[model samples]
Target: AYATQGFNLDDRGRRIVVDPVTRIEGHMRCEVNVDANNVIRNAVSTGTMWRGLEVILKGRDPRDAWAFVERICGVCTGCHALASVRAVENALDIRIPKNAHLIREIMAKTLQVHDHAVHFYHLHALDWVDVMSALKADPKRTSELQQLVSPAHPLSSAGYFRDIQNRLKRFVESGQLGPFMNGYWGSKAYVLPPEANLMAVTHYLEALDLQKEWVKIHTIFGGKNPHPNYLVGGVPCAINLDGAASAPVNMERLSFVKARIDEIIEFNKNVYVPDVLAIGTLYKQAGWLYGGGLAATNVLDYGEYPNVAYNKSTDQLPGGAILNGNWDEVFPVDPRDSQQVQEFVSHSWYKYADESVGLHPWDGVTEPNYVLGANTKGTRTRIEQIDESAKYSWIKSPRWRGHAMEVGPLSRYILAYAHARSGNKYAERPKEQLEYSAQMINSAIPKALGLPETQYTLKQLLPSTIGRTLARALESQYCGEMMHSDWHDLVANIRAGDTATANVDKWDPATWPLQAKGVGTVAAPRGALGHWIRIKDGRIENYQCVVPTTWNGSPRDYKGQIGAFEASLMNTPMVNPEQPVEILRTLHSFDPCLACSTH
Candidate 1:
């Protein structure tokens, strides 16, 4: 009998099944139907758990909503907290001080850098790197390779590499691979050389150490790492220039944070970018990985890291919609717009009061309607099959103007590049920054791929899984540079006697509106994240969140439209159905956060 949660193959081509995909933030299952030629004909993406943070938020104090919503996803903690506070602040029409805005931007940039590094090295790097093969690598050759790619890197000594090789050798010989288990190390899918693999493995270990240091920036500012504290009017951090006070944001802490920022910037420039380029060059040569998972070209970002004035138009990463793959013009993103942004639960394990109609997040419903246990379509001897025509996933389909749009770092980069190239009115004061970012992409990416700079264009850089992965690396570099500037500006603001952080004038319930509605939209690490809130008598009347994973991992909608994950998987060629590394590569590129999706 076939297993219920693993893959199986028979006379009718191979069926790739992963009931719980590994190396992600939350629970998900993927089933792909492959043809004899190792090509995926159909795919089903399912988020397996219900994260009902919105349901928990109802009837709670709107002022305290951030604490609840921040727990939506532990991996993306600060994003929900940021969105929650922004929602509350938007509802009350409260604007924070410049210091608060700068501090928040710095915190966000720090998270982005930390999250991206972890994803590249820990979560996704093993997919491309063959750890077992690294044992055969020459330490001297690996050192040379590292120098060739990142000449300024500190760990380029052959002795250092040899030590790393011995450590890995012992780990492999111990028969306990730990996190390296179940990987297709020597499989045909892995294209990197032994030296390249060794180099990647070394960095993978280094990233772990670097990540700990990076989180200190957050701990100093937000009071903790994972799920940092946040306030509605502004950040909860208090700035103090001297060591005389008991405040967390003292001179010592501030100096350490600044030094950490510099270290992160250096690492991104010398290590992260070069390492990705080295690996990406190999993947690009194996062109099959390029366009395998190309979804809808329409991308969306709700903007992030606002300027001193908190003007949406002047956001560091401007909020906008790129519809129908148009790069010349970007439509403004207003998450509150009912017609543009809406969610449907037609194929999800949830039933709305009105099943036929899609609901805007401002008035969204979260009623679970699980049907997997009730449905019986296949034989017991075979694995349980999903009924695509009926409800299958816990994630609801989120659409923009009736089309599925891709989100995350790729979306943010594409829109920002387009705005810079087209000289759009909404490009804001960061027009020069956007232009520099575009120039870097237009220049650096081609070099990484070993192609002429003229051979690649921003138009061809997005809407593909490989492109999506590349975009995340590039965005990390951009955000790191921006963080440097943000940090200096923040310190200067503090030095200029602007020590204010929060606007507590509206903290009292008496200052709140009798009834009000607001939407908090953020271009979070995963992608566009928004929290919709309806407040009555200083309490939450209704709350909903349309997260990034909901946009990417959604199932088929009422109108039979497939989401980003499903669309990207269609017609993708699989090397081996039993070990669907190709599918993992495509899905992992989006960095799916099922917890955020179901919430």
Candidate 2:
């Protein structure tokens, strides 16, 4: 009886559908069929909205493309802007200065930490934490719990926790609940104690304040928070050494940014990392939740924060592809290599001359042929059962070398960790930091499970639902530390009298060739994000973006291969059919961004 317009029970089994899944970036619907035992047998992930950025980008000036493309998703504005500029610069063969590279890295790192923290406290944390349980928490016990997790945490005080408890009590009694409304507050799936729940709720409130401070780095450098100004050659803002001019980025502003970075680092170390470990411990004990969302072993990362120029091979987060969970060998990633990376619209709500064929982003097509719920006349089709073999989502299936690959923090961590394991020279901070963090967390896991460290390998701690969640937190810690280093590097360069930020020699259209094509790729906070551009006479001829969500949230391909999201949901167990917190736990682990997926 749990049927909707876009879903129905098959003759094979019962299904659970969550249309307009909450707390994600854009419109998304997840449909899964479960057996009588409540284990998922089949799954379908649908991006319900049509992303029009590609259509809007056609005929736009190559110089102005970054501005338009960055609006693809407000949350991921920096990634899009960076990728768009990189695409144009690649076509022009322009390499920016070292100072520019450092500044851009700082901006990207700031966004990375801020976005991941917000996702944990506001979006994904509540799925596992029960807010109603916090109402029964003892303030003194919560303070002791905080101290037990991290003794140096300054916010650990009975009076302070008492105040937080009273505020939560008033909110619960008010019946308004604010952001806490409509949550599965008392569900059986919630596994945290009342004290743990209260501590997390307190940190959730603290993260809200921390996020506001983190965005100031963007505002100082890019002149705004979301959709910040960007240029094809380099960054837009000029760096002034003295405070004479009213420029956005000056010595005073830079100092404030540095201070904020230090604060972010402290918060990550004291609050974010500890909370993830504390909560992760409970779920890890329940072994089923450990490897809950392992989709595909093949992973891709475009690499971010170049050490020298825009060279992917020399990036801090190295660029490459790992196939079938093989760490011994990593395939080099080439975004322009059509044979390796391509998008297929076979099961999407779009049409092509040949639906069975896959198109590379350089030659990708986005012709909508939506026919699932309506006809050409816009009238409903009175059919009993919708066809499962036809177009079902606005998201096209993106394949890497003809295989569905998972992207995001889990992929980035695994790929970067592999680089460290292989003893690659360019693998420095990300590798060492991720390795240490993984060892620390995994060591604790085996101890908690009452098993020897050798018996429970550290490799077994990844590529899962809990693993993805914990990986994001670990990444935040890495980014937070890296931001400090990048900030200091930029400051040193500035102190040495190198204030030049942008190169505008090729800003004019007359410098362009008759026809040029380029690809921009970045290991965005979400995952591997790339933008392909073909410029003819200085105007965009073709524009396509293969985003992170497209890889993780894709549909079945022509060869009947399910995407990461669908594959991960298979065999998932549900406690309550009406309330599938387990499904949400796994789905939210990948940190879905349908805005980027459908785009």
Candidate 3:
């Protein structure tokens, strides 16, 4: 039973429940059962809130749906907007201009760079690097470590560390320790040394400053960062190098973007990647590689960064599905493969006529059905009933070909590894980037661990929580590098006298067919994000999103298979069951976006 079910449910373990997983983007409740050995035996992750953006998109003009669904996530900005526009365009068969496509790609790459840095420093760093412990470090030693880790990051002076340390102390002392929870500050599970911790903490402050500069690229193209403007056929911003600087994107605006892109690339290279490498290497040396989860066997990404319009074959991050740890063959993913991708509500708090089977997104049905497991608590009557398999989460379980797949930078990197190993013609850039990072970690790990002979591959490093976090950093590096080219190509296209940004041919819904349906997919910063839309009479008949969190934080499907978060928590031995730092470590590595999940 356990073999088929994908988790242990012996019911003999102590349950630790965490409501509102701290420092993540949205509200999530996690309950895990730890066996006598203090290893996680079962995990249940629930998205605790829902704000039906898809339901609201119903009956609206298809052209305006991008603006509505873009509100699904404010932090992981632009992906939903991109996906919405792509979906509408697909349904209407609209093609954008080369300059518009190039601008969109550059903007997409910019988001990845900004998001990965923000996640590592602001959201996920505290999980691995403890702030209180950082205060105990010798500032001189922290400076020394920073010098060795990334000489390019110029703020590696002892005074710099001390200043940041003092600032960190004041912040923690002033009771404004936002992500720095007081309870888990000095836990034994924290593996980084005092010097490394202090260096990381310093970068946390540096990142706080640098990421602000990165988002200006968003404003340059989209007019604002959070929920920036979107259009059905193309991006809302226009490129006009010859026009007056007062209106649209002109030469100086382009110049401003160029400077920010270089700075972002610099930050990713100097601060983000090096820190991830150093911290992840330390964790690997400490033998803390527990959270592999579905990454090893099941992973998915609908490739990104198409060099040509409407051509997935030119994707830099080649799209494919990897199963059973097979690096030999990758199955191509068609978002419209119908049954190949379906969302199961058997374990989610959503109603369908037949809940046992999953629903394809185009024909999705969402009706509020409030239900909770361990339904009735202790009372005057005999104790409660525990229906272990009853509906227990607000997020829907999305299975790719009946398998729970982990999706994110990890999936994209893994796919790249598989493709590179197999030698896909279009995968040279991703292959080069991934292999370079792979060798960087391999050498750095042995050096960081003080071992001469140790070697690691992408397969060895990627599935664990360290790999999950490191994948974001590695992707930031890749995306930052890609943005350089993306920016260059945009300028080259503009130089060739193509300044068109939007194609309004189908902007008039009067040109639309009576009825049509399509799927738009993106390898969002979190992972595989897709929007399915059915248009009828120029109005959105139905709209659905199977976002990244729904893939990573999903509940059990009808077959009793667990999702990535639950599987990742499985077998992770906790140092202190009460602390739950290990739980947060793996969960946050996915960078779960609950608002996007529930939507």
TM-score of each predicted structure versus truth: 0.92, 0.93, 0.96
- Candidate order by TM-score, decreasing, is 3, 2, 1
Best by TM-score: 3
Segments of candidate 1 deviating more than 4 angstroms: 1-14, 243-245, 291-296, 373-383, 424-456
Task: Kindly indicate the candidate among 2 and 3 with the higher TM-score.
Answer: 3
The number of clashing residue pairs in model 2 is 0
Write out the backbone clash pairs for model 3. none
> Candidate 2's residue-wise lDDT over 1-599, tens digit each?
22321223232668567876888889888877788988777777888888588988999888888888787788776888989988999888887877778877888888889889998998888888898898899999898888877777999998998899899898789889887777777888888889989999999999987798888888877889986777777777788765555675787888899899999999888999888877876666555553334333677887776666646567777768887768778888878888988999888888889877789999988888877743221233433333346677889889888877888888887787788789866666656655565665557544643544432344676766877888788888888887898888888988998888888888888987889999988878889999999999889999999999999889878876777787677767788877868888888888888888887
In Å, residue 50's CA in model 3 sits off its true spot by 0.6
- 2 against 3, candidate with superior lDDT: 3
lDDT of 2 at 497: 88
For candidate 2, the 10 contiguous residues with the lowest summed lDDT are 1-10
- Residues 313-375 of candidate 1 have per-residue lDDT tens digits of 666677588766677888887787899889999999888887777899988999888775345
Residue 67's lDDT in candidate 3: 81
- On a 0 to 100 scale, what is the lDDT of residue 9 in model 1? 19
Better of 1 and 2 by lDDT: 2
